[PDB]
C-alpha cells in the first residue's frame, strides 16, 4: 500500500550517496556533447519521422527530455563519429516512445521499418545491421514481455534473475551495439558484440534508473525494478537492500577498471553520465505529472 | 594435491543427477546420427580445420561431438542440417579452444566458419550462425593472457559466469541452433541472449567441476572452483551447495517459459552433464584425446 509506494523518503540520502560512491570510485566527471540547433532539429525531426506512422506527435520538449541521456551517458572524448552518435540519439529517443506506449499500439510493420530506415542513413552497411538487429530485439523484447510470465518471474525472485532480464530489457545491450560506430576502438566493438559490454555496465544503470523511476512505475503498475524486491516501506530493510545494490555497483566498476583504458572510459562515463542525467530529467520527480505517462 | 576435485568425484556426481531428478524430472535423449551424417560431420570438420595444420582423430571428434548429440532437444527438432551445422561448429571451435593461440589464423579459419554456415543454413541464420562462431573464437583468443579474464575469475561467482556467457561458447550455441527448432520463442531468446544467460551457470557449474583438474594442470584460470580451496573440505562443501543453489534457481524460472523453449533449456543443461559424465576428455588431467600439445 501507500506506505510502500514511493522512495521518496530516501530520495536526498541515496542521491548523496550515489554521487559519493562516483566520487570515490569513477573520479572522471561525465560531460555534455552540445549539439547544435540545427543539430538537435534534424534528430528531432527524423524522430518523428519514425513515430509518426503510430499516430502520435510526441513534443520536442518530451524528444529533448528523451534525448539527454545520449547527451550525458556517451564519452566525448572518444568520439569519432558524428554521424553514429546521432543515429544513437534517435533510436533511443524514437524507442523510449515505444516503451512508453501502450502494447495494442505497438504496429511491428509500420514501426520496424522507420528503425531500418535510420541505422541505413547513419551507418555503413555491416554496422547498419548490427544496429538495427539490436533495435528491433529491443523493440520485439518491450512488447514480448508485457504482461509476460517470464517477466514476473525473473523480477520478483532475485537480484540475479531480475538484471539478467535487464541486460536486454532496459536497452544496454542494444545501446552498445548502436554506439561502437561512435568510437571506432576495435576492443570496445568486440565487448559490444559479445554483449560483455552490456552485462558490465547493466547494474550501474539499472539501480540508478531503477530508484529514480520506482515511483512512477509503480503507480503505472510497472514491476520491472529491483526495489520492488525489497519492503521499501522499513527503512531498515530498505537501507541494506540499498547498500547491496552499491555493492553490486563498485565491484562492476572495479572490475571495469580492468578494461583497456579507452573502453573503461567509455563504460564508466556511460554509467556515471546516466546518474547526472537521470537526477535533472523531470520525468523522474513525480509519480503522475505531466511528462511521463498520459494515457493508456 | 591441491588441484584436484577427486576426493569430491562421487559425491557431487550423485547430487547433480539427484537435483536433476527433482527439479528437470525429465531426462535428455541422444540424437542416433545415420553413418553418413556422422561422416558429413567429420568430414566437414577436418576440411575446416586443415588450413590450421593440427591433424585432428575421429576419436577426438567424436569427444567433442558428444555434447551436440546429448544437450539438444530431439522431440522438438524440425531441421537436421541445422543440427549437423551445430554439430561441425561446436566441434571446430572446440579444436580452437584447444589450440595454443600461435596457431590461430583467423585469415585461414573464419571463411572455414563461413563456408559451414553458409551450406546448411538460412540466408539470415548463416549470418546470425556466422557472427556467433567469429564472437566465441575471437573472445577465447582475445582473453588467453589478459587482465580482464584475470579480474572476472577471480573477483566474485557474480563476474566469473558473467564471463563465460561469451567464453563457454552458450551463446554461440543459441544462436546456431534456433533453427533447429524454428520456434519463435526460443529464436528471440537466442537473438536476445537471455536464453544464454538463463543456461550459463547450469553448463558451466557442471563443465568446471569436472574440467577441473585438466584445467588447473595446463595454468587456465577460467573455472568457478578456483574461487573456493578444493582442498578445504568445509569450504568446498559450502562453496558446492551455492552452486547447486545457483542451479536450482535457474531450473525453476526457466519454467516460467513456454514449454518448448523450457524443454530446449533443460535438455541443454542435463544433457550436458549426461554427456560430461561419459566424456573421456574429463577423466583425466591432459590425455591425447583431449591434448592441446605445447611447450
Ligand atoms: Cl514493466
Ligand atoms: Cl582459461
Ligand atoms: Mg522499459
Ligand atoms: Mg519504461
Ligand atoms: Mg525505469
Ligand atoms: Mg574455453
Ligand atoms: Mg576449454
Ligand atoms: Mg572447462
Redesign the interface.
Known sequence: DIGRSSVRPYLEECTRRFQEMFDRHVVTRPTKVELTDAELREVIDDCNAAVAPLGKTVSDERWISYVGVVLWSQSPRHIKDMEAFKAVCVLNCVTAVWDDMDPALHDFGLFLPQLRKICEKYYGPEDA?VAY?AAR?FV??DH?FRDS??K???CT??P??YF??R??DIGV?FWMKMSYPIYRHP?FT?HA????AA??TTRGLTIVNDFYSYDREVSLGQITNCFRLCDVSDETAFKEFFQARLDDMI??I??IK??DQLTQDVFLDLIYGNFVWTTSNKRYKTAVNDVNSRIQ
Open positions: 545491421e538487429e530485439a520485439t523484447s514480448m510470465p517470464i514476473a518471474a525473473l525472485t532475485s540475479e534473475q539478467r532480464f541486460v536486454t545491450d576492443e568486440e558484440k559479445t554483449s560483455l552485462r558490465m565491484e562492476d572495479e572490475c580492468a578494461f
